[model samples]
Target chain A: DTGTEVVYRRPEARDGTRVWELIRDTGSLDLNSPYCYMLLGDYFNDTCMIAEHEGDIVGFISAFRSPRNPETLFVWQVAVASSHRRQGIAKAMLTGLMNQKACHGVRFIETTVSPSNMASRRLFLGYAEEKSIPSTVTVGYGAEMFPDGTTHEDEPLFVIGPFFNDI
Target chain B: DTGTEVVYRRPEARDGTRVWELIRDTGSLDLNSPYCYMLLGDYFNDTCMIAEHEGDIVGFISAFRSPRNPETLFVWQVAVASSHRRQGIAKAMLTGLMNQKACHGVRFIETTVSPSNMASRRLFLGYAEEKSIPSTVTVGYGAEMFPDGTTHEDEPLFVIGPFFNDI
Candidate 1:
């Protein structure tokens, strides 16, 4: 590649719509993929990070952690364009994000991926899971309380990885 | 085509095992088609919905309501095969579901769809939200507390169409 160096910064709320557009462009994602934009919208008022290289956006990662679950940084969305793939820029951005908030109750990083997606599979495997929930248990609250109702529950492989710890 | 008629049936837990295999074959779906299995485990205690025509499974719809807000039906997943195209079966299944509601409080239906998927866009447009949620979902649960006293908030499109509304 050229002499490009990726710098990490938390983008303003207004910029998320574009970031979300990138996520939407990758249509092969599961139901969870479509939610990346909504997550960016929330982070616009809270926490969101962007990666820039030589003054051009190259990679990005979004995490969600509020007071309710402060000990975990929910890895919401991460994307790198095909031209800029595999630069370790994503790792640095995530590292930079986690490096901050020393003692900020941040413990877990989680993401869900469709099973057949080979690229995502490699990503999760490289990351490592602190906890791996069954893809079947993810369901809305209505299904839990109604007891005898009908709905779908099959979820993709949800993996929580790159946590500070192995457990 | 050939003495074929579409039928919607409540899938028993055992039927879900087979449906699971079918969904797995759909490369885009992976092991988490949401429509194939979530309803059975969460609401029906291990059953989902199945679409059949000419004694062959064509597609299915899966949904789960909020545990906190049980009255809201979260249509987490739904799918139809390319082989069963132009059959009007998907619309029929959607309307049929509305008819099975047991309580008056069941007022809403939700789905997360890709922005560019025209089929989903048209389907949701007939009954989707005219306005977007400005703040999205802010989850407050038993997970953990944050340093700034925030909580976990995962944002989904949170699309909904009322049971009695015109589609």
Candidate 2:
């Protein structure tokens, strides 16, 4: 069992490098530039969360309010340290992010997962199921839309939403 | 004088690499990851624009509808190749972006420029003046908001708005 208790807090610009490293090592999530992470931390921090264990970053969630609809929260990436897996860290971080002040009015959660990424699909689906919320999957970014010669799969959109009360 | 005429169009995911290279070489604009540019090209293309001169990328503007207000079009970064500088390429790209189909409802334009970035400040202010629209400047991200130890300047917000007709 993972013995240490994890603490969740809003991200800061200082956390950008560590956040970048965590996502880079995930080997599954798309890694963006460190500058992107820093921007998110500085500007979108209210909607993001970081999980720490004994001063080391163990998990992170990058999200933002939908540009077209503030009521929707779009989760960009979720990462948990290799040593901290299977401990519900990801879900906990998601929960913390939703409960933040910036998410007070968010009634929906949206994310895109590739068809073959069953783990990610399950995580989102499981969260919806646990909260008794409805989950819908639809066509998102098509593989053909990516750069030519890249073998990326279609990322299907997973939408969970319209909760009557705070989630 | 740069004789070739530049064509402006919405970006495609394939333009990501060239866009990244252009931004990286600017030596002024903060360069984001190639993947970030790819996502912008794939998802936010409707609100972005690319300038090409005889099949070569010469300029790009990355922008999005603000999360807090769809009426606001937030311009993230503007990059024009050194060889293509002057000749009003930046302003032309800005005009092209605002006139895009996706920007039909955008009533305001927003961006942050550092205090020392008089050129950018002039661009937006001049655009407002040219359009006969009002412009306002205010405190945006303070220098203290960035990561400690990084000597970044304070980025002040520039808002130009409430245009009565399409440009």
Candidate 3:
């Protein structure tokens, strides 16, 4: 494993199946069908990213630009394989995507997470800290707003930036 | 005045200036340039709306379909004039928009509000109550995320739906 390098790059349509598989393994995420994954792979190719370790897909993050606000980047999902946990790969992927030439004008990065999701909270907050920029966590969605409150939790949006990290 | 009528309709380019003025008077909303408002009028006309009372425009709500998840609607603003505040115009306008043909296939409605915005909280919650559907509130963006804390407060997202109120 010492010589195996991890690579991050824009995902291709061919990578959609593997990306969907990674997401399927993470039961916590609201599952979207393969077609949806394919759409992201096809159209949001640049904004979405994939991480490969030793030539095998190990992580994925799906994100897109907000149609209403061209400067806003909204992240949909972030999933890393069990073997790739705590490796800073997700952070690198996020940093890579946000800093890419494709996202040059993006001013804010947005995503929703439940209050209890500590891992996610740390991911974005730590990111804000590293940049010395502020990160705000505000209520984005509530559990009661859904059809079932018993299984659903409110998703708070963790927004980082209004500052540049494109460097 | 007894026969005055409240008309809810799609916003036209001419409405952008008026919408900007309404937001200016509210002072709670983060102001956007008239050009941005004009873009919404031109490109997002179907997704945004206005309320007219006896030919006087008094309310505006801006929203757009998620580019990644067409089934979800992301609301950007809900502004009602001081003269029209007490009436259920906001909710009616929201309901009116969701029921329109343009909103077909949209399953979830989303928006962000601050913790201290009791008016926003009540409006969304009351909306859920009327539909007999659930509504939830979670943190969306925290103040610390902003470049400056003094000018911004944390915003929570108020989301409703996945249940039908199409009628």
Candidate 4:
């Protein structure tokens, strides 16, 4: 129906290239190797999500199940095309992905965001508030970890979890 | 010969009972579910290592090869029985595990230790110093991650890598 303005669904292997391109176009986010993107969209696609408008890809969330932890979902990357920014696409994709049946067992959502990335920080904080899930923040990576003379920002990990399973 | 104080080998399913006991005996490390120890011994025993003395288990390193990052070894728990502490057993176990043929593709070792756990901190630092490999440390888990009034300490992640394979 023409009334459906946006759609969300699991990504396919075919979407690998476009996912890579979307992240590449986002500019500030680190672009993982192309093969990693393929792996996420293929091997780890169940927990990942893609949002489309009029059948054109507009946003993607690259996430995977933690092999060791039974109830954790690690978000490696999140990207929204320039035209789709500030439209709640990121929030919708997150809520939609976590609300899906495949993510039923997942209790916590974790991601690393640089302190400088206030926009990403807000995106996550706002999500936590909207969902009423408690959130926590802590240093994920420190500058000392990088070799001397290397300039890398510390990545603080934001975790939201202990949510009631809606399923 | 029987004179050998300790022997290193892969654990068996029968060792599951003892492995869990050893971790519990440590009284410090967070013990994973009892079943996880069994899974590590059964499914991931190759990368996991155990130190035995006269048919008795004294130390165990629970680790696995990262499925997505093929070249990394993530150590989940390192435990030395109270009676076995201060004997350089931890260092020897780490060295032995990395030298095994099963760990051939591995070039990096990653683990998180609490900031207050100076003993573990020094242990990892000395390993890096002895191996001449650069190590990085960052805040892996922040204080805020735990809910308010929780006693959980901040865990700083230490990673030692780029070792020259002497195999």
The residue ranges of model 3 lying beyond 4 angstroms of the native Cα positions read A1-3, A165-167, B1-167
Predicted chain A of candidate 2: TM-score: 0.92
lDDT of 3 by residue, A52-141 (tens): 987788988888776657688877778888777889888888888887676877888888776776767787888889888778889765
Instruction: Quantify how close model 3 is to the true structure by its C-alpha RMSD in Å.
Output: 16.6
Give each candidate's fraction of reference contacts reproduced. Answer: 0.02, 0.22, 0.02, 0.00
Candidate 2 CAPRI assessment class: acceptable
Local accuracy of candidate 2 as per-residue lDDT tens digits, A80-144: 98889989898899878877878877788889887876767878999899999999999877777
> Alpha-carbon error at B108 in model 2, in Å?
8.8
Winner on TM-score between 1 and 2 is 2
lDDT of each: 0.50, 0.80, 0.73, 0.73
Q: Give TM per candidate.
A: 0.40, 0.72, 0.51, 0.51
Q: Which model scores highest in TM-score? A: 2
What is the number of residue pairs that collide in model 4? Answer: 0
- For A1-167, candidate 1 gives per-residue lDDT tens digits of 67666778776534544554455455543233222233344323244567877766676676655223446555545676566777876666665666654324555554544444555555545545313422221322222322134243223434453344322
Query: What's the true lDDT of residue A68 in model 1?
Result: 31
Please give the ranking of all candidate structures by TM-score, highest first, separated by commas.
Answer: 2, 3, 4, 1
lDDT of 2 by residue, B1-167 (tens): 57668889988867887898888788777666565787678667888999999888999998987654668888888888989877788999998887777888778888888777676788899999998999999987676654455577877889898774354
**Any residue pairs clashing in model 2, and if so which?**
none
Q: Give per-residue CA lDDT, model 3, range B51-151, as digits (tens).
A: 98877778888877765566878777788888888888888888888887768877777777767667777777887797777677786655654332245
User: What TM-score is obtained by chain A of candidate 4?
Assistant: 0.89
Clashing pairs in 4: none
Rank by lDDT (best first): 2, 3, 4, 1
